[PDB]
Amino acid sequence: SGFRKMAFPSGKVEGCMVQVTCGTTTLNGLWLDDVVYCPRHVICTSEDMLNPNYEDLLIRKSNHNFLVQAGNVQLRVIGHSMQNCVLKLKVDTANPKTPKYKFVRIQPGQTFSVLACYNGSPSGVYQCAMRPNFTIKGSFLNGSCGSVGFNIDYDCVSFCYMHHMELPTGVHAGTDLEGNFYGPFVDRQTAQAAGTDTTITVNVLAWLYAAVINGDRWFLNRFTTTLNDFNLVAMKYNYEPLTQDHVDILGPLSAQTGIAVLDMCASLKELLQNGMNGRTILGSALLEDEFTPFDVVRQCS
Amino acid sequence: SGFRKMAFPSGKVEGCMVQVTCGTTTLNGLWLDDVVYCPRHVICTSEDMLNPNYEDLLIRKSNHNFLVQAGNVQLRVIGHSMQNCVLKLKVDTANPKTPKYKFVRIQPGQTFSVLACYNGSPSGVYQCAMRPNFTIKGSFLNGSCGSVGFNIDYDCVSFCYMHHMELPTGVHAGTDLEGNFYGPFVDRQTAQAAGTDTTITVNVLAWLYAAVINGDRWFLNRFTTTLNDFNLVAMKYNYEPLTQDHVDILGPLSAQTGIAVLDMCASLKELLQNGMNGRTILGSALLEDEFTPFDVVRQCS
Ligand SMILES: CN(C)C(=O)N(C)[C@H]1CCS(=O)(=O)C1
Ligand SMILES: CN(C)C(=O)N(C)[C@H]1CCS(=O)(=O)C1
Ligand SMILES: [Cl-]
Numbered sequence A, B: 001s002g003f004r005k006m007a008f009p010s011g012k013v014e015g016c017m018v019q020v021t022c023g024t025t026t027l028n029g030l031w032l033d034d035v036v037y038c039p040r041h042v043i044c045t046s047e048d049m050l051n052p053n054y055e056d057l058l059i060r061k062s063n064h065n066f067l068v069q070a071g072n073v074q075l076r077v078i079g080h081s082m083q084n085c086v087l088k089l090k091v092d093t094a095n096p097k098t099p100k101y102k103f104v105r106i107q108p109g110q111t112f113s114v115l116a117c118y119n120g121s122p123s124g125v126y127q128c129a130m131r132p133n134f135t136i137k138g139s140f141l142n143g144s145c146g147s148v149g150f151n152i153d154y155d156c157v158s159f160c161y162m163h164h165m166e167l168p169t170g171v172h173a174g175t176d177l178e179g180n181f182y183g184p185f186v187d188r189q190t191a192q193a194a195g196t197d198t199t200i201t202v203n204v205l206a207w208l209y210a211a212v213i214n215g216d217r218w219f220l221n222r223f224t225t226t227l228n229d230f231n232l233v234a235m236k237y238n239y240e241p242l243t244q245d246h247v248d249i250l251g252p253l254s255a256q257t258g259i260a261v262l263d264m265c266a267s268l269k270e271l272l273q274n275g276m277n278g279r280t281i282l283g284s285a286l287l288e289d290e291f292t293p294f295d296v297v298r299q300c301s
């Protein structure tokens, strides 16, 4: 037993990380088959970043402008193009360590593992949720750009995130591997803020099921409720609405414990109004919303 | 910026994990060079676990009682011996993925990454601390025995923990890779229970310094404390005594932030008296004690 925030084993991804230099910018690249993927803002000077014309800045560049280092070896860049906010550098050599992989776009409320990297060197791994406001609460310093997020499904790595920048509130914004931003953000030195965030309701309830499976049961009660009643409490407390889709996804956990989702919504309703009455749940004093139902079933079954 | 429980990239450890079977019992082993390390309890049956005479059980085994398996490949065992509570199986093949490694025994308060494994397959990675009562607060289901804990400082893998068992309070006990248990625990099914756990004071202080570095000042105060007055207060909250050693270790974070260690102690004393009054520090509503002074510097500017 026990319940811990757990990343996927990062080895299949560690073997894809490289360093990419263009002028006086160094950051991380993802090397799969004969392509390296990295943020397009790699081509930009501090001057350029205020109002970049990426079309124009990029035709002015050539293969020899991009320095790609896999460990202590140089990669010959033999082609370059841009897909959305992602730069694609064709290289002479196919990554001998390319795993089975897919490019996937994740939904708000879904989790993934981040492999934080510096100068193409894997540094750390942690789990993140894609917030409803389309930011993530990561841990990133200068040179972490091009670090990636992913899930693993048996042998297949599904890459879903590439890190681009930090917003002024300390939270993080990036693209899918097709270079489309998560959220209403631009890769340009301009005035940008994260929208007000909401709590991921289905994840909070997943975590309460994890708490019950681990013998933390005090918050339970004899009551039940309805979507409509609860959702009026949720909206007041900046909680995402709970749908019938959410209640079905939690079905496996409602069974395994004898607390039915609206039964558990009753407990959750009470925790929002009255608080935790000074207790903890799984060693947190907050209601944790970064574990999915899958995350809980995965770890507790 | 940001601050996260962050595990080391697990890749170098993943390439070392194998499955060990003896009788009807399967768990994980650690394959380094021509040696597979696993818990010796793998040779126990139902009766044996109450008073196992491990020397008597092992002499009755030959090499071919041990089925070892690296993915699909069977490894052939050609030798076995016991060192304390760890079984060492000699195999005909040296592991080609063997990283630069070493075995270190850690002290209470030290952190490491756990690669949770089932049937020799890595399942997830997370951070733990050796509690002052020599247990760890892990996430371990049946089959996870032989999972290891490690640091990776400067490309060398330091193995510090092999998982043996769960205590009735739902916390985890294991050995160093020389087979010596952390704490007074034993690999027999007898009435053993962890000591009362305490908070790792040096770690809480390091985390408060992390909070300041990341731009939080709300919990600072105009007070200081003697080291001795601080210890007489902190022990009333079940905090570990803070020693001159611990004060020395925080010197760098003191200098980086300009807050003297005993001033930060005055802030911790106040937080224990007051709580957080509906605020949070680095995303927590509790005082976190599983980040070392070294972890704070690795992750922070
Ligand atoms: C690399 N890149 C595009 C960035 O770092 N930014 C856009 C940041 C500058 C302030 S911001 O909030 O606009 C994000
Ligand atoms: C495999 N193995 C040796 C164990 O699981 N144990 C010794 C645990 C049973 C309850 S206990 O607290 O005695 C530890
Ligand atoms: Cl140590």
Ligand code: NA
Residues within 6 Å of the ligand: A220, A221, A222, A223, A224, A262, A263, A264, A266, A267
């Ligand atoms: Na109920």
